[PDB]
Amino acid sequence: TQLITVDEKLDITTLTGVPEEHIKTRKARIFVPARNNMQSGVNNTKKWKMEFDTRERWENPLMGWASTADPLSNLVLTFSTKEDAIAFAEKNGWSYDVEERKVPKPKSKSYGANFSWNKRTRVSTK
Amino acid sequence: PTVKPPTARKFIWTNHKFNLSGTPQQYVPYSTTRKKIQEWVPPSTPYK
Amino acid sequence: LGLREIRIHLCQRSPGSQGVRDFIEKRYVELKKANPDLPILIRECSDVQPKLWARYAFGQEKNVSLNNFSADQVTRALENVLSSKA
Amino acid sequence: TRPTVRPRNDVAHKQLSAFGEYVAEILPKYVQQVQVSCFSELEICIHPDGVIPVLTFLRDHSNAQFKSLADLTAVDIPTRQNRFEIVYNLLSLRFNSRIRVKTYTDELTPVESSVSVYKAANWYEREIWDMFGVFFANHPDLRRILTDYGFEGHPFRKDFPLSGYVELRYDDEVKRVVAEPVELAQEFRKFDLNSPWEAFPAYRQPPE
Amino acid sequence: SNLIEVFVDGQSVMVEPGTTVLQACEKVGMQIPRFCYHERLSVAGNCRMCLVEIEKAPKVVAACAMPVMKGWNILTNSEKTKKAREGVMEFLLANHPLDCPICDQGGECDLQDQSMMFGSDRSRFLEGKRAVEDKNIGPLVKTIMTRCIQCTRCIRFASEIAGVDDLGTTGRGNDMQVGTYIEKMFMSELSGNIIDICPVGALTSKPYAFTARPWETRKTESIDVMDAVGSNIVVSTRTGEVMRILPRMHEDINEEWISDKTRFAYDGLKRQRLTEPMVRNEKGLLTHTTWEDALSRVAGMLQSCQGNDVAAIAGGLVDAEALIALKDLLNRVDSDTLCTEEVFPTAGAGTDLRSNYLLNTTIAGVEEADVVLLVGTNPRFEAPLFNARIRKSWLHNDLKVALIGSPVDLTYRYDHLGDSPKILQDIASGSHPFSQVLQEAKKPMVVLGSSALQRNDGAAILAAVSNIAQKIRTSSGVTGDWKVMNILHRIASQVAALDLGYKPGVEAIRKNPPKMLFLLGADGGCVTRQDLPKDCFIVYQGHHGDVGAPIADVILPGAAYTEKSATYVNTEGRAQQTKVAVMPPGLAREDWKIIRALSEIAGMTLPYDTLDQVRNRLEEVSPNLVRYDDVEGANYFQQASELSKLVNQQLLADPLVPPQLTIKDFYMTDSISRASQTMAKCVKAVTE
Amino acid sequence: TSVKPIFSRDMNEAKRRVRELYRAWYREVPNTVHLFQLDISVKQGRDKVREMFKKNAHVTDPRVVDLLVIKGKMELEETINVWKQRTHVMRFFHETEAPRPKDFLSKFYVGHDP
Amino acid sequence: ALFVHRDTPKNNPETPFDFTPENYKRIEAIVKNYPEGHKAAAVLPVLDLAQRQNGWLPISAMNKVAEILQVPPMRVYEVATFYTMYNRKP
Amino acid sequence: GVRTSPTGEKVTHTGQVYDDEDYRRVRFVGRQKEVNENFAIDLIAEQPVSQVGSRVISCDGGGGALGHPRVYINLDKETKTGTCGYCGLQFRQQH
Ligand code: SF4
Ligand code: SF4
Ligand code: FES
Ligand SMILES: [K+]
Ligand SMILES: [Zn+2]
């Protein structure tokens, strides 16, 4: 046979070596990142990300730098689909919540609408 | 620098200081920025 | 001591909420006329099972399932709530 | 496109494509993909049950003689359900060529150890255990090789943070170097450097 | 279907007639470069960066404006397409100043990025560049016009979406300059979005200026709480400090815009903050103390209360977690006196049915309407992106809008019916001419402002507007899925406070005053110490010390909206959660944490410990507060109308005057805006 | 759901390996306390072994507990052979770490962590 | 030569400009050459009439043409700066 | 152009000084707070405004490739000088 039947939910939290504080009290956020409205490019909105809740960042007493105690504060993962991301979060015992992908709705663009006879959609200048 | 002198600037140190580490003139780091969050100062008058 | 608020949750389209919807369409107006200062919080949602929350004095909340009821069973459960004040 | 563009090696591309056909039809039990890159490198993508037949074939066949294991590598790709990609870089001294053998596993399925094929692999797949957690079955001495002795987790996984979970310092009370939870005086400042504009249209993934 | 077949690089794709070449290439996952094109603005076609080759056609077409003909093969990666791109990028960069290090757009510049992606790598421009005089258009938008590439997204935004028509191009040729031509101060309610749609550094944010840089910022996706629109934002932070607020795209709310209050009131968030607990000392002054002392002094007074002796006002900026926290806490004392600042009338159904206090149609339902009646609201300043949706429907769908109220500027043209509330009775009888317009309307839409419900006769106004809505919907050709009655709120805390069952308005505190009062961020000044008894124990729990804090006995420093993950419900019933961008300053804590710790000190411990358990409670009170980015429809308008006909309330003779008449009254409404120096510069600039 | 095993076909063989690994650690603990010259007692180290074994007592997958037995044998091999020093063995006993706040109220007092 | 405007004592929006009444009749005749709904098409002839009255265009002829045609003043400023016959200087 | 707080502590060109009750003044106790006394805002204010006769001038900070990128400064505003965004040298059109 050399193949066994495991009917259990895939949970590898004992194997990853992560402490229990950063497993059971963290909230993953599974999302497609929003487009930077400073720019018209949409290439950064293609993949699913997993980040975590931002914990405390305090001031360094010596230099004023941003000190942290959160190890997972820089941890951003990248997934092809939402379901891969959810499977990875459930496999590692992370509590997650999922925003659906926001695509821009299709627009009806008409350059002739800018010069209409009887509609309000005339441009006053060009 | 006796032959080819360094180009004079008004901000260059005229008095070169050596390594002052371990002396009272040593460098102590500090944050050069100001306070970020301004706190609410409660009024010094009573509330009755 | 006594009843403080009644919460009614329901779906807009589920058949399990059909009795709750048929209660709110007919009997809620004379319920609110009979109970002028009682908050009766009808809170529709998308996929919930129907539910009758009743908050009494000192934060004590009883929980009644209204799933697959008729309007008559919702009227009987709600008048049991209004008659208890427990 | 003469001075600044890398010149394409068409002869080696054709030769490595023909040899990839050769390996794919000698071993169709395990070979899944065969791909030749634009810079003329041959990848054989196999099923992990054929680690020992494919590597033993490439080591011992008269038209292969890949006697040298250059490197053995895992790559963690978390969006794949078989997230670990075990890469074998082989070197032929007889035919002056290199071949890449690639296979997959997740955290729990073991890969068969290849020390019976290459004794070079003894520390490499032990490093893959230490850094990724990929267990290699029927290994002579599989244990950690690079991390500290009490170390928890596998550092080259991509869900493992850059600074880890514990840090060390000497403590004068217990007269002992101790492990305490990690706190940075300055956090590692993450830079979102990726451009919002597509750079390579030839690599565009098709939409859903 | 009438779909035509076009080809993008040979790949077949079925597009609608009227599709441009750019949209046809977007459907296969290819993004054509652009500078003047923007999918929410009218098409300009005047930067020529989108020039693509159609095969068997000896001329490159402007892909933003050219409709696809059937059978075209669009060659997005061909050689003369790339030659067109490199030539146009060469002309774009010929007179562009070498300002990339001193530019705030650097690192997030479209001109930089698609010069890297599509331009050449060097210059042939051996001449002297031009220099354009800088324009002064206000305290918000810094203007450096040498960086202008004359894409005219300015003029199209201010002409179409902002509705101002006061930007333009003066001059001609290379001397053509974008500006106002006079020393004019462009102060719209949406005037900071030209920072967003300027692709280059010609229009930057003057408060954000020089401070940060885009790669080092951490983008946290959160919610606006400055108004009841629920605008989705990115709070970008750098090293534990909030740097700016950018919009998120959400097609149903704020499409990709935000208001100037949303964009620029984040610097009141770092002034006047409550950082430590305060109690009154022996002299009667507020001195700093620990959480143990402050929570013990609140809990000792809470244990000595029962019934109407303890009350709570919820302010404008309070999340549903703290709302249900203080509700459960005061119900452990058996106190139902939980109030909001913003008065909503409780006659009839009151807040029992959700359909009589929501924007029941949607924000996106403005696009479907054909007639809009606006009663007693100034939606330009109460909810600026709801007004932006009305202007977009006005422009594109030829929407008829009528206002009952003071004749405010709304950035479009409406039929001003007048300001007396007797017009609501005239429309409800049919003797008014606009009543026949509402009857013949296919999708009419009547919006009552929540500032009109602040009057003493707010119940009569609500009954009259509901009477108009039910005279239309139950009789005319309204479909039935279409909701007519709508209420536009202006307060982010309000709708979730009504769903959790608070009593709207502070009339139940003036009716019987308590000996202990909670103020969750209550800075409206609705109930001061002249209304309470002799020594009321006022506990202010908030994040700014503005109004409710100097009269408080114990001060509890809370988190702000950038500082907590927190459920807010907008004016249309969509529940939304913020995310933690930064942590609260000093000893300030999250709000329901404070209320739950207060319950643990008082010996009336609340049955939740983590935020997930607070949200399980929040689902128990109304299960649509945990279904995020979901509008749940509310039926039963007929039953609320029948309940509204019971007690006949009379209309006062005072005309409908919204409180925000001009741009002056816009910039400071809540405790974060009043603490903002940028909003202070806005108010000072619009008065002079 | 047909997966290749590591050592155990099902959970009974897996518990056999858990049980033999526990026997090996229980025999080893007096030697570890002696030759590392730890300041703990043998009962205290055995309680720590029982704590580490009861930490993973929820696992129902045979492959996961096969890997747990493998990593426990690796820890044992690093402890029998003197590869660990005294510090690596005493890192199980979090002695210099301050006691963390447990209930809601003390966690509220010190900070923002849930 | 500058395509921005600055308020000088000789040229400001309080500089007195108004059409003569026969110029108002000529403006009525100009506006009646264009369709109803496109009164904004009469910006160039009425602004040229303002220049032929006054000799040049202060920024009160531009504002008066913007008022009597109900167009935004920026859309008259654009036309006055675009075309080379309109003398923005005396 | 360094000024001094009432605590005696020098103030940097940023404006940074520690408060009277801030404990972090103890790092300078027995040592020194190192400030630079050549304030750039005072030194660039001492440079005279360059009178030029062109409508657009260029600045690269002096030295060619040793300065900053060459930027072009408009001088149409007669009320205000034209200031370089990099080096802070300011220019005036003489007519
Ligand atoms: S707008 Fe863009 S290209 Fe121009 S100076 Fe700024 S960053 Fe550079
Ligand atoms: S300032 Fe910016 S948005 Fe406006 S026309 Fe110039 S480049 Fe376009
Ligand atoms: S994008 Fe088509 S020309 Fe500007
Ligand atoms: K910009
Ligand atoms: Zn310079």
Short mmCIF file of C-alpha atoms in Angstrom, two decimals, chain A residues 27 29 31-43 46 51 53-57 66 73-74 95 97 99 102-111 114 118-126, chain E residues 18 23 31 34 37-44 105 108-110 113 153 155 159-160 165 195-196 218 221 239-240 244 246-251 256 392 394-395 398-399 577 579-581 583 612 629:
data_model
loop_
_atom_site.label_atom_id
_atom_site.label_comp_id
_atom_site.label_asym_id
_atom_site.label_seq_id
_atom_site.Cartn_x
_atom_site.Cartn_y
_atom_site.Cartn_z
CA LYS A 27 -5.03 37.79 13.55
CA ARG A 29 -5.47 39.54 7.31
CA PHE A 31 -6.54 40.52 1.25
CA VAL A 32 -5.63 41.85 -2.15
CA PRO A 33 -3.76 45.10 -1.42
CA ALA A 34 -5.44 48.30 -2.51
CA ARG A 35 -4.04 50.33 -5.37
CA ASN A 36 -1.85 53.24 -4.34
CA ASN A 37 -3.99 56.19 -5.49
CA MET A 38 -0.80 58.19 -6.05
CA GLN A 39 -0.41 56.01 -9.16
CA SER A 40 -2.42 54.47 -11.98
CA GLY A 41 -0.50 51.21 -12.14
CA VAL A 42 -2.33 48.06 -11.08
CA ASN A 43 0.49 45.49 -10.97
CA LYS A 46 -2.59 41.01 -8.49
CA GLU A 51 -0.14 40.29 7.04
CA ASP A 53 -2.17 42.82 13.33
CA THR A 54 0.26 45.63 14.05
CA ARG A 55 1.47 45.47 17.64
CA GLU A 56 3.20 48.20 19.63
CA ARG A 57 5.99 50.33 18.20
CA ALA A 66 11.09 52.70 16.57
CA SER A 73 5.44 42.78 12.35
CA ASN A 74 7.31 42.63 9.03
CA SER A 95 -6.90 33.09 13.13
CA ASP A 97 -10.22 37.19 8.29
CA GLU A 99 -11.46 40.69 2.48
CA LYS A 102 -12.22 44.59 -5.16
CA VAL A 103 -12.07 44.95 -8.93
CA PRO A 104 -12.97 48.28 -10.55
CA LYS A 105 -16.31 48.03 -12.31
CA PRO A 106 -16.34 48.40 -16.12
CA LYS A 107 -16.81 51.98 -17.27
CA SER A 108 -18.55 53.25 -20.39
CA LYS A 109 -15.98 55.61 -21.90
CA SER A 110 -17.04 57.87 -24.75
CA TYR A 111 -14.89 60.68 -26.08
CA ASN A 114 -17.65 65.27 -24.04
CA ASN A 118 -28.33 67.98 -25.21
CA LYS A 119 -26.64 66.23 -22.27
CA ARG A 120 -24.97 67.60 -19.16
CA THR A 121 -21.83 65.60 -19.94
CA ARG A 122 -20.34 68.31 -22.17
CA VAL A 123 -16.95 69.45 -21.06
CA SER A 124 -16.64 73.19 -20.65
CA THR A 125 -13.02 73.09 -21.83
CA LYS A 126 -10.35 70.76 -23.13
CA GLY E 18 -18.22 51.31 -27.33
CA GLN E 23 -10.35 48.68 -21.90
CA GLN E 31 -2.22 47.79 -18.68
CA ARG E 34 -1.29 56.60 -19.63
CA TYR E 37 -6.47 58.90 -18.95
CA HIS E 38 -8.36 58.18 -15.77
CA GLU E 39 -11.35 55.83 -15.71
CA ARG E 40 -13.49 58.20 -13.63
CA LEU E 41 -12.69 61.36 -15.59
CA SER E 42 -13.71 62.25 -19.11
CA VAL E 43 -11.33 61.20 -21.85
CA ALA E 44 -8.78 63.83 -22.84
CA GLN E 105 6.06 62.20 -5.71
CA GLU E 108 5.40 56.84 -6.16
CA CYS E 109 5.59 58.76 -9.43
CA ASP E 110 3.84 57.56 -12.55
CA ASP E 113 7.76 54.44 -13.06
CA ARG E 153 -6.69 65.73 -14.91
CA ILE E 155 -9.43 70.56 -14.91
CA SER E 159 -15.00 70.53 -13.65
CA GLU E 160 -16.80 67.20 -13.34
CA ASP E 165 -14.93 74.98 -13.11
CA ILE E 195 -3.12 65.45 -5.26
CA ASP E 196 -4.08 61.81 -5.90
CA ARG E 218 3.37 50.91 6.05
CA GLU E 221 -6.29 49.70 5.33
CA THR E 239 7.84 53.87 12.35
CA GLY E 240 4.81 54.03 14.61
CA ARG E 244 -0.99 60.62 5.69
CA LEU E 246 -4.87 57.92 1.11
CA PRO E 247 -8.12 56.52 -0.29
CA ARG E 248 -8.96 52.93 -1.05
CA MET E 249 -10.99 52.06 -4.08
CA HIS E 250 -14.50 51.04 -3.14
CA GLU E 251 -16.95 51.37 -6.04
CA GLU E 256 -11.58 56.33 -5.07
CA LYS E 392 -22.00 61.89 -10.86
CA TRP E 394 -26.55 64.33 -12.19
CA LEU E 395 -23.87 64.50 -14.86
CA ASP E 398 -29.31 63.49 -16.22
CA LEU E 399 -30.66 63.18 -12.68
CA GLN E 577 -13.94 47.48 10.66
CA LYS E 579 -7.44 48.20 11.51
CA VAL E 580 -4.72 49.18 13.98
CA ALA E 581 -2.37 51.53 12.18
CA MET E 583 -0.96 52.20 18.98
CA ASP E 612 -13.63 38.22 18.84
CA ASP E 629 -18.69 45.27 3.75
#
